[PDB]
Symmetry: C4
Subunit: 185 residues, 4 copies
């Protein structure tokens, strides 16, 4: 339960990484180093989320590095390629002027991004935010066959590589709704 | 007739409950320390606080709707996972420049007329069940064909429930309006 | 062509009429010629609202026309999409940005006219559920005109619910759509 | 490969052609180089306004390339979507954004590019209605080349109107999506 949820939010934090770079180039109050961290209190507290996202980006590729225990079977392929652009129109646009010169206001903006965190995970739509396509992630439904268990029903999968039809390659499961794939050497 | 519109707009207030919590946390005024001037600055926070208590009351009302069992027939078959959940309705309701902006009072009631016009024009188009804030409270949305104990089979109507429900399970229900309805699980 | 485009763009005018009656309250800043001179955009959007009143009564007078018009409909089916990207690009801008300078207000009126010509050319006028606030419902219906023949499921607009296979009244917009009434 | 992408980005950069027309109006500041130094955001987008004209004559050269190409299309069908999620995100919200300060004005120009890097890779550059403002009506076509086989529901771009099942002319963006026009 816990380990299915900590990796779950990691794509969403990776999905907000393209948002996070704007705040540095939107908040530029630029020697009294105590005053600079006082005046520019907002970029120095959001830069760690850039460090969080890169850490999850290295984490996401490290799941694919585990190759000593993975199973290898895929039946068929289908590239649906939705990547719904409406999510960009929900989460990145409404922070026009993210730092409107009052920290009490800026609590609510940071309150907004975490409340939609529970919203946009529990609705199970995190894999269609088009910021994930910036990192070359291709989306597709494939009904695989497991080597041990039976046939799956056209499950949504996200991966960085283009798959041909019925290619028995490596992968790694995320849950029984989505997973992460690989290629066979 | 009046109760259908009443619990329709009550579900709309439950959808806007997070907007309400955001706007108490947004436009509350700092004392940092004669109270009547602070109350005069507290007018938008207190009216949306009354709105938030209305949301609490209608959430308790929905729990009461789950609680009446004496007049409840069961008679449920099948299940189909529709799961539409269009987030554009979130992007229009809960972020009107994030609710309100703190400059002018007549502009504030202009946004008040904006949100009540939005309320009437999305209750008149029979698609109130749209926001992904109902799923924040734990609800899930999917469309199931139902037979009646007295009447026959429905025609692919929308259902709403909190607890998890599956195919051909004979479970409880409520009656929101003549079209959509709330379900539970049979104990 | 001129009358067809005129009563085509009038639906979009009535769509934006709700935005105009918001912006009356939005930009109202209250020997009165100074008050006239400062609040010129309430006056011109009030004029636009009067144009909306004129077109609402114009299509109402169109709906009274049933004698000289042909009145033949068969069948019915309902689609009823009326999505909200239209209102997301219509109302949400005018509450999104700031509205002070008249020089930039000229550019916002140029927004209005170019988004009108976009929504005219691409055939997305029959949209923005502000129309459905005025009793309107959307569904495509294959109608029969026995002088001409059977049509193929063209999208239709009416202010009343119409069921299947009823020889109700209509009035004709242009080569694809029409407004509809109910027979007596 | 190399020549495909530079023509692929031209559809997006001409879809923002009218966006440049209001930036010179929204930030209209009206020896004399100090006047130029104030209004850098009109005069920079006036250059891509000239680039929008430049690609508009360039795409006509693509249609008017030569005569040995552009052989035949067998079938035709229509989709005509012009989905409006791309509007209110691409043309509109920059006016929803405000231009008053220098450091944001560079920062919103990075918001232009990071849209387009996504928008190219999502393969959605046949959907802006601003491209349809220039007279283009957009519709998928199954084609059969004489020397090649039958392709499966590829996307066609055409200014002038075409009917169904006619052997007509074309031109290429790349192998997948293509320009269509009419046979003399």
């Amino acid at each position: 339960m816990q380990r299915n949820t900590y990796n779950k939010v990691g794509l969403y934090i990776l999905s907000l990484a393209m948002l996070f770079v704007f705040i540095i180039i939107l908040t530029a109050k630029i020697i009294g180093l105590k005053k600079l961290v006082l005046t520019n209190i907002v970029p120095i507290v959001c830069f760690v989320f850039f460090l969080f996202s890169i850490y999850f980006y290295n984490r996401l590729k490290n799941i694919t590095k585990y190759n000593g225990q993975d199973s290898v079977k895929i039946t068929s392929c289908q590239s649906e390629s939705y990547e719904s652009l409406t999510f960009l129109a929900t989460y990145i646009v409404p922070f026009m002027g993210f730092s409107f010169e009052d920290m009490q206001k800026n609590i609510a903006y940071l309150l907004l991004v975490v409340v939609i965190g529970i919203i946009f995970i529990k609705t199970d739509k995190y894999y269609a935010n088009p910021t994930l396509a910036l990192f070359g992630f291709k989306l597709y439904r494939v009904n695989i066959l497991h080597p041990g268990s039976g046939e799956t029903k056209n499950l949504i999968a996200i991966s960085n590589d283009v798959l041909k039809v019925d290619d028995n390659v490596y992968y790694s499961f995320f849950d029984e709704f989505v997973f992460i794939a690989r290629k066979k050497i």
